[PDB]
Amino acid sequence: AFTVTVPKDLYVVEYGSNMTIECKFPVEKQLDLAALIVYWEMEDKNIIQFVHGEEDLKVQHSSYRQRARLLKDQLSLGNAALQITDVKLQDAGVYRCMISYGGADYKRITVKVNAPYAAALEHHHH
Amino acid sequence: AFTVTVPKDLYVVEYGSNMTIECKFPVEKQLDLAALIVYWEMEDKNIIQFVHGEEDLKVQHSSYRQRARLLKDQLSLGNAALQITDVKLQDAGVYRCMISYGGADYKRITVKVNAPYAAALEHHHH
Ligand SMILES: COc1cc(-c2cccc(-c3ccc4c(c3)OCCO4)c2Cl)ccc1CN1CC[C@@H](C(=O)NCCO)C1
Ligand SMILES: [Cl-]
Ligand SMILES: [Cl-]
């Protein structure tokens, strides 16, 4: 019974920091990279689309350009880790990691962003 | 390039009526029912989970119990049609049909529900 799991369903991160959001999927010893599809989104925004052992940045939402990456090292360990660099207040929301690997499933992850006045003020007027 | 498509991304339905929400996926001549995964949800509520040629009502959200069904006749024609009977105001929302069939994709469908005063009054006072 194919299941994606999340060690943490909540992340509290500081504006300006890097975060790694993780989800696990069952890998039995050896990864079948051909069959693997990893897809990250927040609300409805495409972050990552890993298919046929390669990311597809053509479909990636502009706000996550050059600052969103899948950690391919961890994929062998059944960990689809999404790193977001330079976290903004816009990154606060519900993420979804959708994985297909024989079966298919997804999990939700809530991200809260703490920001000082200055950063908040700018986001407020936007 | 595996793609789910929706003829209509918006449905306006009357309280008390039945609705059929549709998604298409490419079927090349013959359906491989073993590989097919169809999954319907509305705002994170599980409606349908079709896998290994069979629905799984164990994970189905209670509000869609006995009144939500996948049209299996149309699956061979690459049409994952979700029928909801006796539409309520609670059914208004964003639906997602997630399909895995070799590749994987999903589409969003917005449903609006028109209801008379009486039905609205009852929904208003949850
Ligand atoms: C068979 O069960 C499912 C199946 C699919 C499911 C079905 C079909 C396709 C895809 C999928 C795969 C990759 C993609 C993609 C879509 O579109 C493009 C990007 O790459 C998924 Cl994912 C989805 C869900 C479930 C069931 N889960 C288990 C409980 C519940 C859950 O975990 N909720 C979240 C809790 O935080 C729903
Ligand atoms: Cl996590
Ligand atoms: Cl439709």
Author numbering:
A (entry chain B), B (entry chain A): 17 to 142
Paper passage:
In a healthy system, PD-1 engagement by its natural ligands inhibits a T-cell response, resulting in reduced effector functions, leading to cancer cell protection but also chronic infections and decreased autoimmunity. In cancer cells, overexpression of PD-L1 leads to the progression of T cells into an exhausted state and decreased tumor cell apoptosis. Here we present a systematic overview of the principles behind successful anti-PD-L1 small-molecule inhibitor design on the example of the m-terphenyl scaffold, with a particular focus on the neglected influence of the solubilizer tag on the overall affinity toward PD-L1.
The final resolution of the obtained cocrystal structure was 2.1 Å (crystallographic parameters are shown in Table S2). The asymmetric unit contains one molecule of inhibitor 2f and two molecules of PD-L1, which form a homodimer. This type of dimerization upon the interaction with the inhibitor has been previously observed for biphenyl-based scaffold inhibitors of PD-L1.32 The terphenyl moiety of 2f provides a strong stabilizing π interaction with ATyr56 as well as numerous hydrophobic interactions with, both PD-L1 subunits’ amino acids, including ATyr56, AMet115, BMet115, AAla121, BAla121, and BTyr123. However, it should be noted that the electron density of this terminal part of the inhibitor is poor, suggesting a high flexibility of the 2f solubilizer tag. Therefore, the presented spatial orientation of the solubilizer tag was based on possible protein–ligand interactions. The molecular conformation of the main aromatic m-terphenyl core is well conserved for the small-molecule and protein–ligand crystal structures.
